[PDB]
Amino acid sequence: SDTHIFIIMGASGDLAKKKIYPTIWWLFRDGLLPENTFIVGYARSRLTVADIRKQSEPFFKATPEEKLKLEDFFARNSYVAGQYDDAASYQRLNSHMNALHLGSQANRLFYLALPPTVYEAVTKNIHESCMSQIGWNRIIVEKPFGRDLQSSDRLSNHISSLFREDQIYRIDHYLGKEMVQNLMVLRFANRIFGPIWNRDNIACVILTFKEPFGTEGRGGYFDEFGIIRDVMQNHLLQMLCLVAMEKPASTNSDDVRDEKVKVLKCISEVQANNVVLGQYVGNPDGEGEATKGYLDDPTVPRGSTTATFAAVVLYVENERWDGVPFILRCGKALNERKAEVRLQFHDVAKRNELVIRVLPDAYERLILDVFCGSQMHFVRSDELREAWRIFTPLLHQIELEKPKPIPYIYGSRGPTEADELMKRVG
Amino acid sequence: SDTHIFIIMGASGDLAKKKIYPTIWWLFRDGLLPENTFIVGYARSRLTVADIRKQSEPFFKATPEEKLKLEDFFARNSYVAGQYDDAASYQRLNSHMNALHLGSQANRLFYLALPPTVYEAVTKNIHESCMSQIGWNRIIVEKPFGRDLQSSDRLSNHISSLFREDQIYRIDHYLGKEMVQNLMVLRFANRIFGPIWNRDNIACVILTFKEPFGTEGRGGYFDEFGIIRDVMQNHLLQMLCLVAMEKPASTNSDDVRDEKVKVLKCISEVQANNVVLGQYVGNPDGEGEATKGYLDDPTVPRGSTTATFAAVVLYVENERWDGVPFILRCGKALNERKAEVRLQFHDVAKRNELVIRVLPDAYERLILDVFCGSQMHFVRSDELREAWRIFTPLLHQIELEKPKPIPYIYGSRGPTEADELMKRVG
Ligand SMILES: NC(=O)c1ccc[n+]([C@@H]2O[C@H](COP(=O)([O-])OP(=O)(O)OC[C@H]3O[C@@H](n4cnc5c(N)ncnc54)[C@H](OP(=O)(O)O)[C@@H]3O)[C@@H](O)[C@H]2O)c1
Ligand SMILES: NC(=O)c1ccc[n+]([C@@H]2O[C@H](COP(=O)([O-])OP(=O)(O)OC[C@H]3O[C@@H](n4cnc5c(N)ncnc54)[C@H](OP(=O)(O)O)[C@@H]3O)[C@@H](O)[C@H]2O)c1
């Protein structure tokens, strides 16, 4: 119908005040939100709507002549306080949601702005207390999708037990404002160059995510995570799919995501001698955050073997590709800020290659994609499992054998051995 | 065999001293010339080899430690003096060429560094006096290939009467050091994207030759010629062919040139309402040659209606293309120095487009291409005729009706109406 509730589970939190409260303001402010939308915060910390505004409006960029819309926005806002495993609380939520205008019939969008240590609990209660009887129910689950296959599996199974895959919006939104455009053009590209993109013409596909800036004083988070999990397993691996996938049956969210998965099921398990891990050390003869290395960051615990740059060769194995090496190369603290897919062709009779680089605005597009109900740019349960199947074995070997990453100087291309790997293949 | 003669017909001239004498030095100097090569100058002006050196070595970039090769080069040089229609002179040439070591058997390369007002004469004499009996004979003919169809036809017929098309090397070499690379990648590109490049995917191909610099004090030459003849009829029209051509039967000089011609025969005659001619006026608020316009050049005769920039729509008409408008856009004194072919695609469910931009070194590659005997990057008699057939009617209408070109400010993109034309089509 025409009435929507946006439940921000964990409204006290950072993602809460710093991204979603604002990002929703910017969709209200420019009337992209369904007209009869309400916002309900739900955490333990006993606070008022006014209280949220005071710490959050800073990040809004409220200009003294839009402040009559804004007043109307906080009029739509409420907050109920309660535990995440206390049916009495989820009760005091669900019954307050019925109070709101047409709440009975209303659509329900649940944003789990909560560390997934509490997902099993929150999901179970939302199921049996809070789900709309008439309205659709959609849960936005946040990274990490677990750390290995075993863990992502155990959790993903808990959620796909309570919720249909068409209610599970897994949101990755951390690699910057253009992050969805990346995925669009690489699909618009599979369409065009489909008949060309074969082992026949192509020798070596390379997908590249460079960032120039460091970990910047938050290395301590990046640490318990690492560059393979932060960029490759999720994003790079996804666009690799968009390149190698077949003609989707249609343009349906599920027909494409099907095709992506089909690619993934035909990649076997990345092995160590196809991988060059690299950690950044600070710059002698530079200035800014570039004098500081990874280990100079005081939130990184002493002597971290954590990869801050990786180069990895995957083979898709079927008729269409095969021998064809996909190279995923990505790093924090490098030379440029580049996101590009290069396809090198067999220069039969200087090698020849094709390159692909990069008003609603990535995160914003994802909040609307979920309200609309297109699951396109979100990862599917089965897509994720396959993704983990691949990297887990390597990842497990690294946690265990704790191999020292190849030092590389801040603002470098990466380690030298990374390029020597690209060549040892094609 | 292993013995070659390079006859520079018109050795006194500019192209003589400023380009070919040097360019051959640079192929001798880096031993790319067949080992037993001789150089013979032939003009009227009674001068010595020494005499050539004095005015020409300046342009050589002779470095005081390669000057033992160089001595050996001028040892290979000679010069015989004679008229261009005096069988007694062509006699004193041909008999002096027999004198040279193995001249009897020798291969003969004739460079017509002569204004084509004398081509009919020189060609006829060379035929009946000078052609090697054993060795191959190749004539390098220089621009202009005439000015209209009637004229290019009358001359081209005179030459294709004395010489097999596999002896007629028509050399265009004036649009800069990378000019052959342009044509290479656009063919390497027809190969790759062949199956894609259809009316199905593509809406609007645009081929673009911008130069930032003026006519620079030599407008007076450009004038009796004009931007359609200087850049479009010849170069742009050629790469249009390389884009739209079919799979050549093989990679033979003649199989490809065949395919190019096939494209051209399927373009009908450019008409005036598909054309935006533009002349540059100098820059008020700039400096250098940019204060000066076209007409401020003192070699341009007062009130010239001469096009210094053109935008033209051609339609290739067959199954493969059709409706598909090729737009050729080119200008002297513009914003950048760009040579690029853009292919815009039908963005089914911001318009999407493919772009193509840009040790032996263009002119150098052409001198060797002719010694080797690959006629690839040279225009064919029949290719040229078709080229002229197209532009002549328009061109004739402009000489006759003398239409004032749209003024455009130096360092501009071109005239505004040029873009309004691109849109009135696609
Ligand atoms: N790239 C990334 O991986 C990335 C970036 C940012 C965040 N995230 C994800 O975003 C989600 C939200 O994190 P956040 O940054 O907003 O901050 P957070 O402070 O970790 O979580 C926000 C709220 O969660 C509650 N909370 C925190 N720790 C808890 C615990 N151990 N037990 C129970 N409740 C707890 C608190 O609510 P109350 O005190 O009010 O009850 C807190 O204000 C997480 O899933 C996180 O993994 C992902
Ligand atoms: N983009 C272009 O269109 C371009 C650029 C440069 C030149 N070209 C072409 O290059 C060729 C050579 O021209 P150039 O620049 O070297 O200079 P040029 O001086 O016009 O010709 C060189 C020599 O030709 C002879 N000559 C000149 N005018 C003559 C006439 N009316 N009758 C008889 N002989 C004559 C003279 O030789 P002697 O006094 O020693 O007998 C002169 O030294 C021409 O075909 C020209 O069209 C093309």
Numbering used by the authors:
A (entry chain A), B (entry chain A): 29 to 377, 386 to 394, 433 to 500
Study text:
pmcGlucose-6-phosphate dehydrogenase (G6PD) is a housekeeping enzyme that generates NADPH. G6PD exists as a monomer, homodimer, and homotetramer, with each monomer having three binding sites: one for catalytic glucose-6-phosphate (G6P), one for an NADP+ cofactor, and an allosteric NADP+-binding site. The latter allosteric NADP+-binding site, also known as the structural NADP+-binding site, is important for maintaining long-term protein stability and for promoting oligomer assembly. Oligomerization is central to G6PD function as it controls the activity of G6PD; the monomer is inactive with both the dimer and tetramer being the active forms.
Structurally, lysine 403 (K403), forms an important contact with a phosphate group of the structural NADP+, and studies by Wang et al. revealed that K403 is acetylated in RBCs under physiological conditions. Mutation of K403 to glutamine (K403Q) mimics acetylation, with both acetylation and K403Q disrupting oligomerization and G6PD activity in cells. Firstly, and consistent with our hypothesis, the mutation of lysine to glutamine disrupted structural NADP+ binding—no density was observed for structural NADP+. Additionally, no density was observed for the ßM and ßN strands of the structural NADP+-binding site (shown in black on G6PDWT in Fig. 3A), which caused major changes in the globular structure of the dimer (white to salmon). Secondly, major alterations were observed in the αf-helix; the αf-helix was extended, causing a loop to protrude into the G6P-binding pocket. However, in G6PDK403Q, the αj-helix is shifted, preventing K290/E287 and E347/K275 salt bridges from forming, explaining loss of tetramerization. Therefore, we solved the protein structure for G6PDK403Q and confirmed that major structural alterations occur in the G6PDK403Q dimer: the structural NADP+ is not bound, the catalytic G6P-binding site is occluded, and there are major changes in the globular structure of the dimer. These observations explain our biochemical data; G6P occlusion hinders G6PD activity, and dimer distortion prevents salt-bridge interactions at the tetramer interface, and these findings are consistent with previous structures solved for Class I variants. Interestingly, although G6PDK403Q forms a dimer that is less prone to dissociation, it is inactive and thermally unstable. It should be noted that the resolution of G6PDK403Q is relatively low, 3.65-Å, with the crystallographic structure having high B-factors.
